[model samples]
Target: HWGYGKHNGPEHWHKDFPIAKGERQSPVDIDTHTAKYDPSLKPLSVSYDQATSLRILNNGHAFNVEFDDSQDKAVLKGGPLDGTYRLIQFHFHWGSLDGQGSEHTVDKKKYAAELHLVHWNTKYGDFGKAVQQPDGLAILGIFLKVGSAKPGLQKVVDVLDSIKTKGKSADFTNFDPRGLLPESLDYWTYPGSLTTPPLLECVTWIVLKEPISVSSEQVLKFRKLNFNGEGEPEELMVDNWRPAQPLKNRQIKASFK
Candidate 1:
């Protein structure tokens, strides 16, 4: 029921999910001016097995490349995390056009889109249970700039046609999610919540400062997805990103100079 629609959008989410207005909410503007540099933050280590990527699907919100989290086949560690965090899924957020898609901003600037790699703390048993504790989830946020098309992302773009409508899923494997990361792992770290409803305040946000490229033609494929399921009104899925929330008293740390 809570979606990116006029009456049911982020502005109205607080009615159903009261945490929508909670402090430490996600996608906060990373004001480069105020983000402090921390010398102790270690380099992020990401090891993803190609075969762990299971399938792709449209869950009425955004397309997701779900992974086999049963094993620690893929994980994200170091940076700001205290232990291993298993990769659960990764998804994207875009606008009706290039220039306004990304959920987070740098100095108040938005990218063409944003990529979120979701992981859960292995110490918490599972994702469902992890969301109940602080530091139970970790999101590796990467900005998607409009430039040359990315080869790794092409694997995803090629499958969009098969799952064009909500509730559709198809086989997808051998995809290395690590290929999506920018060369530099420099990032901003903060304590935040999920960008979607339920808005659990369990995530440790690790947003990369450098961005990877995606061509305009390629990003257009993401918009072809329908928010409405089959036999429905056919609402094109775009601008599904939650706007940057208030930072409140939280401090954002930088991993690099």
Candidate 2:
């Protein structure tokens, strides 16, 4: 029952998962003024096959749209990475209110939500094995601001009603997650861990600079999701995001000048 609660929330996670206090924790604040511009960082290459999309499920913490990663159908490469990373799933984190839910922030500014596309390096064979290595995972992060409606995001919103409670899932297909990306490919790269439990120090975080727009009405629908399962007292799945960790000694490099 680990969730965003005072009893079992992020603050209590370090007691069980010691890695929560580790050096390279994720969702760090992007101090744009101090971000180093790396001309060597190449353009990030990403391609998602609509056929690989499988289902969307509410896993208590967040609802993720799973993908078939048996093959390299949906893959990402380049930009602070050595090998190709296969897209496994994509999920979102948001807040109870519209303006303060994103995990990563820019110059101490928060967004309404954040989307994370989880990927694992093909060189390690599988996500299980890859997750143990330092260069095993790559998470592409996109910030979401409440403004105009996003047609691409609405496709997923339409199905949220079907899996409104924890442990519930529905078939999701023909949806290429790439359509959710913002106009610019520019991003900031750093070594960090998974923002959630087990908090493995193996993620190469590539957080986008530009944010996508989402209608206020659309985000209101997201709050409808219940973190509590059927037969339990309902708990709204809002503010389902981990706060930014200390940047520590790591350097954040930007792909843009």
Candidate 3:
């Protein structure tokens, strides 16, 4: 049902949601040469057990999970992020096996994909209500690279067979979203916006410098999802990701303390 062409690509999403036209989008190139970022910024900490109560959502584009005080007991704290942040929806931006996937980049190099774990501060109340507000979200980003050996994402893969179809999802009982995080949780924090439609400007982005590794088999299977109609020729949703947006004049910060 979905096809990738000049007018049918991700660029058209904003047309459906006018708000996306003005929001601060993701996949911005992290230019290390053009400017230097101050590393003195400190990151607030949320314990592993607290990070575990997140509700996972596998929305066609990729996997995402929700977090909230009602579901998760995690307390968010960091100079820039000190407040009641409720975990909302989390998802991934990736590429096809060839040249069409990846969410974020640095120095023009695109990795396999980037994961966005979305959250909204309770300063705006529940996540469902917060997302409607312009600046009430936080997204934690984690990158994924394709490797011959699986990165330990069996926890994710074991469920993939169940959600092979687009828009198809299953309930995950007692599953922890933290398990999806890489070994290194230390991340680079910044002020950014949602990458999808109605891309909101109200978000504190925590991007991990480290990447989680998934086997080539996993990557191939991810590529097999169809963007074309079931009756159409062999077509796949392999390249659903969008190109990076311009950073404009905003400065991106990192968590150094």
Per-model TM-score on C-alpha atoms: 0.98, 0.98, 0.82
lDDT of 2 by residue, 1-257 (tens): 57898789888888889888889998899999999999999999987753388999999999999999999898899999998999999999999898799999999999999999999999999999989999999999999999999989888999999999989999998887877999999999999999998899999999999999999988999999999898899899999889989999999999998
Point out the worst 10-residue segment of candidate 3 by lDDT. 51-60
Model 2 backbone overlap count: 1
List candidate 1 segments past 4 Å from native. none
lDDT of 2: 0.92
107-201: candidate 3 lDDT, tens digit per residue: 67788877776667777767667766656776777877876545445656666656555555666545566666777656665566767655667
Error of 1 at 134 (Å): 0.5
Q: Each model's number of backbone clashes? A: 0, 1, 9
Q: What lDDT does each candidate get?
A: 0.92, 0.92, 0.63
Task: Measure candidate 2: CA RMSD.
Answer: 0.9
Q: What are the runs in model 2 whose C-alpha is more than 4 Å off?
A: 49-51
lDDT of 3: 0.63
